[PDB]
């Protein structure tokens, strides 16, 4: 009946990713007697990073350690020796060279597996694995020490020049500067190339298979978007989010995915459900965003079919 079934499998984001996209915190794992939220999505999120607001310090910068103030650091593993992050592709392939399985992994799964080898806070019994960001431009895997992805409050964060040691205001985004980044949970699957979305589909419009025909998605929210990248950005902004008081308390920090308060321990789930898909009309520059899994393609030459998971730029 439907010629699109196997083709369309990777766009069942609830099934193939199974966690937030915007904010992925779809599992909890204990570290030193406390449950912490952490990324658990099985697909790579292409073009995702974290914007730190009112700040020149980028999120792939190592977290603040020692004499450094909070706002002077980013989200990434600090430079200790032996140096685990950032690790380049060739360094990772050399590091795992006697492991036939790991050495032959694609760069994204390799990065996710490397990050997943870090033990959190000296808790060897812990299922908690740090997320990572792979940069395809410089071929570097960056392990993320901070697994929080959004902290935005006129009370939850400080926005100042002088206040150097106060808490980050931050949000997830597909910025142009993040175009070569992929955000990687511990759960990123082996075969994400087969089962996960990557490139946007030219000459294609997502539809629903109804009575032997591919019909339009019944409910669509339409927004202007000058190009494909802008549409992917908007879809990401509306996508499944595992994000959740008057102040940023310890419990509120845990809920946002925070684990540590200055080298010490701090003491919900979408499951992939959300506005994860967009149909981009290249002609009218309209981004048609929806929240039901698509089951077929309408072949319309004005359309590119995009996903919150998909690369912001790449087309096939």
């Amino acid at each position, epitope marked *: 009946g439907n010629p699109w079934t196997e083709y369309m499998a990777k766009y069942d984001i609830e099934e193939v990713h199974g966690s937030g996209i915007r904010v992925d915190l779809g599992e909890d794992a204990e570290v030193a007697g406390t449950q912490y939220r952490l990324p658990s999505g099985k697909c790579p999120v292409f073009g995702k990073g974290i914007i730190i607001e009112n700040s020149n310090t980028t999120f792939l910068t190592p977290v603040a350690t020692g004499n450094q103030y909070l706002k002077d650091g980013g989200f990434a593993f600090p430079p200790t020796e*032996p140096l685990m992050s950032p690790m380049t592709l060739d360094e990772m392939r050399h590091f795992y060279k006697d*492991n036939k399985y790991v050495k032959n992994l694609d760069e994204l799964t390799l990065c996710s597996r490397h990050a997943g*080898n*870090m*033990i959190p806070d000296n808790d060897k019994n812990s299922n908690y694995k740090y997320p990572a960001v792979y940069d395809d431009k410089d071929k570097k895997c960056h392990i993320l020490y901070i697994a929080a992805q959004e902290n935005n409050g006129p009370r939850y964060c400080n926005k100042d020049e002088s206040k150097r040691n106060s808490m980050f205001c931050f949000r997830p985004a597909k910025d142009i500067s993040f175009q070569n980044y992929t955000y990687l949970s511990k759960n990123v699957v082996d075969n994400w190339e087969k089962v996960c979305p990557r490139k946007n589909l030219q000459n294609a419009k997502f539809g629903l298979w109804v009575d032997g025909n591919c019909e339009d998605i019944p409910h669509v929210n339409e927004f202007p978007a000058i190009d494909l990248f802008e549409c992917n950005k908007l879809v990401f902004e509306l996508s499944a989010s595992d994000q959740p008081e008057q102040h940023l308390t310890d419990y509120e920090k845990i809920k946002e995915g925070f684990k540590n308060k200055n080298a010490s321990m701090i003491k919900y789930k979408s499951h992939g459900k959300g506005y994860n898909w967009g149909n981009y009309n290249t002609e009218t520059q309209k981004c048609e965003i929806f929240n039901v899994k698509p089951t077929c393609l309408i072949n319309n030459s004005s359309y590119i079919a995009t996903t919150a998971l998909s690369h912001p730029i790449e087309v096939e």
Partner: antibody
Amino acid sequence: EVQLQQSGAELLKPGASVKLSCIVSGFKIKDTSMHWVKQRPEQGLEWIGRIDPANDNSEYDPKFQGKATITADTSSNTAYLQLSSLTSEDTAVYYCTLSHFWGQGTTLTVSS
Amino acid sequence: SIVMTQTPKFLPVSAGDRVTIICKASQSVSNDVVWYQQKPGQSPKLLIYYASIRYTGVPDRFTGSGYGTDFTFTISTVQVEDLAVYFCQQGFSSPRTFGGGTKLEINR
């Protein structure tokens, strides 16, 4: 944070046997080969062997077959080098490596 | 066992001159050669891996090249602090033999 911690300096009589340890902290050893390398006073580096901790397959230079026994423990993320029938030629610094990352070495003195 | 013949054993060099170290494999080791630096009293540190790739943190003055049997390690302009023993190692097949090493001497 990843650290390698090698056991303390050892002094043993000839004919004895020693078990040296290499404790890795902050990292899961399962995916990475633990190598042991020997360096005698003022001499070069000699590869002793390596273990695949995921499958307990350890291999050696034929010079060390019968001398060295390399084990690994993925539970405690520790690698071991046992040396048997100790000899003055066994007097050396013994380095463990977490893949291409080297420990600080353990000095073994074999002497009566 | 593949023999890695490392020459020269001892290399006197002045600050700012070229250090060339050669390591010959008795059997073809593809591109799987690493170069280590051992400063006095310290553990060996990886400078070059897969014959020609500079590790992160390793200064631009350090390079390697070669494929098959013949491998070259170069310090383009030695600095006094480069005083060390340098070792090649093949990783292509076990035993993973080291070259004999090259001891630098800074001319003064």
